[PDB]
């Protein structure tokens, strides 16, 4: 299936996905300061995004998309909107509106001597249309 | 037990595995309070005898193990020890010594705040032995 095969994608890969953002991690937060150490992750799927009952499983069911820095979070969402209620409305989690994203497979090498580095999907582009 | 089979495990599954905690997320932190919204995750794998070594891809290359609550973090590690440097020492991430973990597939939900639950591996037991 697509998410299992996407999870095998090598660093450098760029994919266009269409569907819905069905969740974020962490699901609650109050300011940009929450993301000094913690990372904002989005969950994306075009497979039964609606069904209540849905148990998300990143890499089989949906993909995890990291927004890697506070600066990138701000660029996309604005520092003034960086509370989970507001990001939720912006990402249309409670609405049927479809989303299109370009994601990029990056080597995400965290802090100093690493964590170590891991391969993750990061948000290249996002359209709240169409 | 392949990683693929581990990614498909039904909620409630328990597994005893041996290998190494090779990293933690977040990889740097100062106190327990950083885990109010953020979740501590550990990365488990079996290590390479005489080879590299490196790019973790959770679910394919290793498993991510979540310690779902602050209460659980303290119970295992101690509120006094909840700094990334101290936990790294406790988890022996810089010694070659093998670790033994028991993980449980849990439905992790999750404030229940227009969120969905996620199936994840939770730390049931760990031995440094």
From Swiss-Prot, chain A:
It comes from the Eukaryota. Changing residue 47 to P: Disrupts interaction with POL1 but not FUN12. It is found in: Chromosome, Telomere. Signal peptide: none annotated. Coiled coil: none annotated. Present with 319 molecules/cell in log phase SD medium. Interacts with POL1, EST1, FUN12, STM1, STN1 and TEN1. Single-stranded telomeric DNA-binding protein that regulates telomere replication. Has a role in both positive and negative regulation. Promotes [TG(1-3)] strand lengthening via interaction with EST1. Promotes [C(1-3)A] strand re-synthesis by DNA polymerase alpha via interaction with POL1. Negatively regulates telomere elongation of the G strand via binding with STN1 thereby inhibiting telomerase activity. This is Cell division control protein 13. It comes from Saccharomyces cerevisiae (strain ATCC 204508 / S288c) (Baker's yeast). The gene is CDC13. The chain holds residues 346 to 475 of 924 of the full protein.
